[PDB]
Amino acid sequence: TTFDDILEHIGEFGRFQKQTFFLLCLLSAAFAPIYVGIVFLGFTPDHRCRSPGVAELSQRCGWSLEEELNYTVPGVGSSGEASPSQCRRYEVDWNQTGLSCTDPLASLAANRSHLPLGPCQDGWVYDTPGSSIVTEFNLVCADSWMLDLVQAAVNVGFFVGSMSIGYIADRFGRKLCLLVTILINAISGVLMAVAPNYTWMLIFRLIQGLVSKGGWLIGYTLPTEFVGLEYRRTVGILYQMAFSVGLLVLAGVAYAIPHWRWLQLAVTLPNFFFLLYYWCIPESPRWLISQNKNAKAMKIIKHIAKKNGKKLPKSEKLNPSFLDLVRTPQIRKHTLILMYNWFTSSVLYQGLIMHMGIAGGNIYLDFFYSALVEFPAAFIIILTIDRIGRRYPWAAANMVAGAACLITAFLFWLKTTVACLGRMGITMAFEMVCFVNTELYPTFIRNLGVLVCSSLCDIGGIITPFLVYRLASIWLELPLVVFAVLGLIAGGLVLLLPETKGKPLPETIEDAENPHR
Ligand SMILES: C[n+]1ccc(-c2ccccc2)cc1
């Protein structure tokens, strides 16, 4: 007796699976913000040093924002293309000593260089009507690193969170861990909007990061276990699609309400809504059967059977271990290759979206187009995964990503199209990685196998904001060349991974030892 055969009689894809997947995929939307929400929660608008005298001078004569932009602000191009205008104040005696409206500073200095420069004090003025983290905490001139540090904190939380949560989930089931992660993520997200000081907000963001990705992956693994062999691709890829749709909705919601506090408070409301009603999904019977807890598994199977609409026919110790993950040489090889794939995926993904994307345009529209590019990738992957196997299309997608990045490295009209194509390729590679990794490991360590293998992803996220800079100074286009090298090498290494087309996912370590047999 095997789980697959029992599943066949109940029905690989039926009413129960439809309901479960429809409820589950919404969690993907709730995780869409945590990953890439810095783009909207914290954005840097055009800003200038506060000028108390300018306030008085504005009512003296007719003033316009564009007009006042130049004759009452330090000129750009001195000791930096934009350094003076950004966060340097002339500190002239504008108030009580106004020479004239046309040339208030012409008589004081008469020369851009002659005009004195000093530290940016009295605060800052931001053009955007909608506040944000940057405006809230004045992280503009001497604290630019702070905004990147927030994202680095999220990327650091993901790491430890995965490393612990994977072990906890694989030792005490998926359902309980998923519920706890959902609750902690919701509470941290909602409390973030009430952080009075920057430090507390950063700590709350770290706490939320510790749980977000772990919960997301634990939610991804479950539907694959529920579904049968034939329909695995559909659920596995439609999950990714929800993330895409979720990403798309978030763009619109961000345009709807700009105030970052309100944005965060609202965006996590679905996270709270899930907690109440997601306690109607059962624990995966595969884990119970593998863990020698068939008693509960039979009740779960009966519950599934009654809802499905078919009649069920009448008819030693396994524990997780980190060292076991590498005990088997073949498992060692698989894990190493997959970890390298994670690392080479995260760097490309984050770096290209933050930099590769076409410059200019609104904050929202460009992100919208970035989200839109992914939908074709899901379609192409769905078309060919079963027909020509998972291995070759994934390798080809990684190769295409690397090639597109390299050709972009060396009026940018072609650059936009190449960027979109590359942007497509990288998502294809990421999805393929996420799909294959679950199906490769044995069941009783799968949750521990993937999450730990995903920990290396975090390191890439930390490296990208730093590495690029060090490379960018060394040579203008060096980061793209390195990206291409990483992409192509990863695509080549992918070919070595054993193929899985019709093989049922293994439930023992020996089975994973020799996948060919
Ligand atoms: C298209 N796309 C979907 C999901 C991811 C993802 C990133 C980090 C963790 C989990 C999923 C990346 C790309």
3-state secondary structure 285-354: HHHHHHCCCHHHHHHHHHHHHHHHCCCCCCCCCCCCCCCHHHHCHHHHHHHHHHHHHHHHHHHHHHHHHH
β partners of residue 126: 47
Report the C-alpha gap between 349 and 344 in whole angstroms: 9
For the Cβ of 158 lying below 6 angstroms from any atom of ligand 1, the answer is no
Residue nearest to atom 12 of ligand 1 (CA): 430
Q: What is the number of the ligand 1 atom nearest to the C-alpha of 427?
A: 1
Q: How far is the CA of 223 from the centre of ligand 1 (A)?
A: 17
Q: How far is the CA of 461 from the centre of ligand 1 (A)?
A: 13
Distance, CA of 239 to CA of 181 (rounded, Å): 18
Strand partners, 47: 126
- Rounded to the nearest 10°, the torsion over CA 251, 157, 162, 347 is 60
**Could you tell me if 178 and 211 are in contact, meaning their C-beta atoms sit under 8 angstroms apart?**
no
Per the CB < 8 A criterion, the answer to whether 400 and 358 are in contact is no
Q: How far apart are CA 287 and CA 498, in angstroms?
A: 24
The 3-state DSSP class for residue 48 equals strand
Q: How many CB atoms lie within 10 A of CB 378?
A: 19
Distance CA(141)–CA(119), nearest Å, equals 11
State the distance from the centre of ligand 1 to the C-alpha of 285, rounded, in angstroms.
26
Give the integer Cα–Cα distance in Å for 222 and 281.
10
CA of 108 from ligand 1 middle (Å) equals: 57
Alpha-carbon distance of 331 to 316, in angstroms, equals 21
What is the Cα–Cα distance from 440 to 232, expressed in whole angstroms?
Answer: 13
* AA identity, residue 255: Y
Q: Which two tokens stand for residue 481?
A: 């060349």
Task: In whole angstroms, give the CA distance from residue 155 to residue 460.
Answer: 9
CA dihedral 196, 201, 204, 208 (to 10 degrees): 130
Question: 118 has which bridge partners?
Answer: 89
Query: Could you tell me if 515 and 334 are in contact, meaning their C-beta atoms sit under 8 angstroms apart?
Result: no
- Residue 476: how many other CB atoms lie within 10 Å: 10
Q: How far is the CA of 351 from the centre of ligand 1 (A)?
A: 14
Q: Which atom of ligand 1 is nearest to the CA of 345?
A: 12
Which technique was used to obtain these atomic coordinates?
Answer: cryo-EM
Q: DSSP code of 118?
A: B
Q: Resolution of this entry in Å? A: 3.6
**CA distance linking residue 71 with residue 413, whole number of Å:** 35
Residue 11, phi-psi category: left (phi > 0), alpha (psi -120 to 50), beta (remainder): left
What is the C-alpha to C-alpha distance for residues 245 and 95, in angstroms, rounded to an integer?
Answer: 53
Delimit the domains of the chain by residue range: 3-44+140-513
- Calculate how far, in angstroms, residue 198's C-alpha sits from the geometric centre of ligand 1: 28
| Euclidean distance between CA atoms 73 and 75, whole angstroms | 6
- CA-243 nearest atom, ligand 1: 3
Asked if residue 174 lies in contact with residue 221, where contact means CB atoms within 8 angstroms, the answer is: yes
The atom number, within ligand 1, closest to the CA of 217 reads 10
423 lines ligand 1 (CB under 6 A): no
Quote the CA–CA distance of 438 and 33 in Å, as a whole number: 23
At 107, list the tokens: 């008589």
Q: How far apart are CA 414 and CA 222, in angstroms?
A: 42
State if residue 447 touches ligand 1 by the CB under 6 angstroms criterion: no
Q: Compute the distance from residue 136 Cα to the ligand 1 centre, in Å.
A: 29
Cα dihedral sign, 432-436-437-439: positive
Does the beta carbon of 213 lie inside 6 Å of ligand 1?
A: yes
Ligand 1 atom 10: the closest Cα is on which residue? 213
DSSP E strand stretches across 30-173: 47-49, 124-126
Number of other CB atoms surrounding residue 235 within 10 Å = 21
| Nearest-CA residue for atom 1 of ligand 1 | 427
Determine the Cα–Cα distance for residues 39 and 424; give it in Å rounded to an integer.
20
Cα 36 to middle of ligand 1, angstroms: 10
Q: Which of 162, 243, 353, 427 to mutate to test the pocket of ligand 1 (most atoms within 8 A of CB)?
A: 243
**Alpha-carbon span 188 to 176, nearest angstrom:** 18
Separation between Cα atoms, residue 56 and residue 207, nearest integer Å: 45
Amino acid at 424: M
Q: Is 374 in the pocket of ligand 1 (CB under 6 A)?
A: yes
Q: How crowded is residue 387: how many other Cβ atoms within 10 Å of its Cβ?
A: 8
Q: State which H helix or E strand residue 136 sits in.
A: helix 133-137
Q: Which of 434, 420, 322, 307 is nearest to 372 (CA)?
A: 420
Residue 63's contacts (CB-CB under 8 Å, 6 or more residues apart) are 57
Q: Are 390 and 436 in contact (CB under 8 A)?
A: yes
The helix (run of H) or strand (run of E) holding residue 198 is helix 198-226
Alpha carbon of 430 to ligand 1 centroid (Å): 7
Which one of 430, 438, 457 would you pick to mutate in the ligand 1 pocket, going by the greatest count of ligand atoms within 8 A of its CB? 430
Evaluate: CB of 430 within 6 angstroms of ligand 1.
yes
Give how far Cα 135 sits from Cα of 111, 139, 173, 190, 479, Å. 32, 7, 44, 20, 30
Dist CA 427 CA 149 (whole Å)? 25
- Dist. CA 380–CA 369, nearest whole Å: 18
Residue 93 DSSP class: -
The Cα 517–Cα 513 span in angstroms is 9
C-alpha of residue 470 to centroid of ligand 1, in Å: 26
Exposure string for 42-65, b = 16+ CB within 10 A, e = fewer? bbbeebbbebebbeebeeeeeeee
**How many whole angstroms from its chain centre is CA 419?**
19
Residues 6+ apart with CB under 8 A from 401: 348, 422, 425, 426, 428, 429, 487, 491
Question: Is 35 a pocket residue for ligand 1 (Cβ < 6 Å)?
Answer: yes
Which of 27, 28, 35, 379 best tests ligand 1's pocket when mutated (most atoms within 8 Å of CB)?
A: 35
CA dist list (Å): 308 to 9, 15, 226, 301, 497: 10, 5, 13, 10, 36
Phi, psi of 191 (to 5 degrees): -75, -20
Backbone φ and ψ of 116, nearest 5°: -70, 155
Under a CB-based contact definition with an 8 Å cutoff, are residues 240 and 433 in contact? no
CA 236 centroid distance within chain = 18
Three-state DSSP state, 449: helix
Best mutation site among 427, 459, 464 for ligand 1 pocket (most ligand atoms within 8 Å of CB): 427
Distance CA 99, CA 410 (A): 53
Q: What backbone phi and psi angles, to 5 degrees, belong to 312? A: -65, 140
| Nearest C-alpha neighbor of 405 from the set 489, 494, 473, 496 | 489
Whole-angstrom distance, CA of residue 455 vs CA of residue 452 = 5
Q: How far apart are CA 68 and CA 62, in angstroms?
A: 10
240 lines ligand 1 (CB under 6 A): yes
Rg (CA), the chain: 27
| Cα–Cα distance list, 331 to 207, 248, 335 (Å) | 32, 37, 6
Q: What is 3-44+140-513's CATH superfamily?
A: MFS general substrate transporter like domains (1.20.1250.20)
Q: Counting atoms of ligand 1 from 1, which one is nearest the CA of 216?
A: 10
Find out whether the beta carbon of 243 lies less than 6 Å from any atom of ligand 1. Answer: yes
Cα–Cα distance for residue pair 41/90, rounded to 1 Å? 31
Angle between helices 174-192 and 260-267 (to 10 degrees): 160
User: What is the C-alpha end-to-end distance of the chain, expressed in Å?
Assistant: 19
Looking at residue 81, what DSSP letter applies?
S
The rounded Å distance from CA 483 to ligand 1 centre is 18
Cβ contacts of 472 within 8 Å, gap of 6 or more:
478, 479
* Ligand 1 atom with least separation from CA of 377: 1
Residue 351: name the closest of 436, 455, 470, 215 by CA: 470
